[PDB]
Amino acid sequence: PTHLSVDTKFKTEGLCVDIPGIPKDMTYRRLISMMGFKMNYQVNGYPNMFITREEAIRHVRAWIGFDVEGCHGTNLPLQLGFSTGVNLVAVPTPLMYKGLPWNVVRIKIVQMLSDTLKNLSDRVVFVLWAHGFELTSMKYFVKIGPERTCCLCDRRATCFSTASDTYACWHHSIGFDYVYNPFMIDVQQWGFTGNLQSNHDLYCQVHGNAHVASCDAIMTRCLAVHECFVKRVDWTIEYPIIGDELKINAACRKVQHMVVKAALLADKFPVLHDIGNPKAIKCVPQADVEWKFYDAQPCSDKAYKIEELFYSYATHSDKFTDGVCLFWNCNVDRYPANSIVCRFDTRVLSNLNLPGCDGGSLYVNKHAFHTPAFDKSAFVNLKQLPFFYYSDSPCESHGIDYVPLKSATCITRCNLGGAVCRHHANEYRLYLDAYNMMISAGFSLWVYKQFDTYNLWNTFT
Ligand SMILES: COc1ccc(C)cc1NC(=O)Nn1cnnc1
Ligand SMILES: [Zn+2]
Ligand SMILES: [Zn+2]
Ligand SMILES: [Zn+2]
């Protein structure tokens, strides 16, 4: 059970309005044959055009919703819609394009998928709510065959060119006209009652139905993400490194240690309530503070209600008002005023952050985390945490050329003494790099209103 057997049954009830008379008994093998594709008994890495739900989840970065609506089926123009917002009209002679023949439409498809996916995935997975026309239109822009490599690099081939008779990956496909060996999954096969809009609207109010193919393509991919990442969550699935994952995670651990350590030194809290990851470790192991941990896995649907995080049933909760609360990526509706908070901003544009369900986003870095929509009102009791670098380490070099550092936010004994030493300047610039990496990845930092770095200077006496 590695791939989806071509002899698996495909429910054809969703297909019978575009294709009336379709057999109720249908296998993937017969469907693929009906679509105009010949697998010809080939054991070359492409056993089926269609993939399992499990394989689709492993390749979420490759998901592109796809819908086809009949504008007028051999003699009529089709509107091709993609979860990128693109609508192309193909004539058989929110971005809406005018009627053009397939030979030019297919060039645009390859360009669009290539620009969208080159930094996300080695493939495309068309996410469908299959009614018939999307499957029968594939033959006009898709070619299949054995698994191949790019003509310019070692990556797998995702495109084919009839002009040059060559294959390319998403990075080297300029001028290519066919999508080569794509994958697809039909959301309707999962067992739903009612149409696409009725199932999508149950979970999401951000995607409306403006009655174009791209709206359906968006809704289809949204509903798929809800089913695979919101209601059902899998933290055993690892995802490849496609960008700054390692640097971002390392920056996150540096910022956390810095901010929490300085909050403990500035306001000397006697107790810290660490609410979040059940596998969390003390980010400041040498701190005096009474460290108390509370387990809450990342919320993937709605933000946790703060009232429910403290709901102790028939017994008393701990006194959250005593000391400080640390919410490191533990997303709540409204933070207590005595908090240190790291909250991922779902609106961030990046190769790690994919569009999600109901305003939320699917953040993919080692694991997939569907995150609830960033909401500014969650931080009404707090303020934005300013950048600062703090260090009590000795002014000792141990060792990359140099320019003297002048900064009001380098909180060290040397800067108090009038001149930042080389070590603390090197460490300040590295910390500032890590800090900017974390902010630009989408993370935002918030703190209790009494926080003041001026209180850190007297820790050097
Ligand atoms: C669902 O939460 C609980 C369940 C049972 C019990 C006994 C306690 C809690 N909570 C709790 O004490 N949270 N806390 C965090 N910072 N101050 C208080
Ligand atoms: Zn290539
Ligand atoms: Zn939606
Ligand atoms: Zn120094």
Curated annotation (Swiss-Prot):
Residues 49-230 form the ExoN domain. Mg(2+) 2 binds at E69, H211, D216. Residues 239-461 form the N7-MTase domain. Coiled coil: none annotated. It is found in: Host cytoplasm; Host endoplasmic reticulum. Residues 357-371 are annotated as: GpppA-binding. Interacts (via N-terminus) with DDX1. Interacts with nsp10. Changing I19V: In strain: Omicron/BA.1, Omicron/BA.2, Omicron/BA.2.12.1, Omicron/BA.2.75, Omicron/BA.4, Omicron/BA.5, Omicron/BQ.1.1, Omicron/XBB.1.5, Omicron/EG.5.1. Mg(2+) 1 binds at D67, E134. It catalyses: a 5'-end (5'-triphosphoguanosine)-ribonucleoside in mRNA + S-adenosyl-L-methionine = a 5'-end (N(7)-methyl 5'-triphosphoguanosine)-ribonucleoside in mRNA + S-adenosyl-L-homocysteine. This is Guanine-N7 methyltransferase nsp14. Inhibited by Remdesivir antiviral drug (GS-5734). S-adenosyl-L-methionine binds at D274, I275, G276, N277, P278, K279, A280. Zn(2+) 15 binds at H200, C204, H207, C222. It comes from Severe acute respiratory syndrome coronavirus 2. Zn(2+) 16 binds at C395, C414, C421, H424. Plays a role in viral RNA synthesis through two distinct activities. The N7-guanine methyltransferase activity plays a role in the formation of the cap structure GpppA-RNA. The proofreading exoribonuclease reduces the sensitivity of the virus to RNA mutagens during replication. This activity acts on both ssRNA and dsRNA in a 3'-5' direction. Zn(2+) 14 binds at C150, C153, C169, H172.
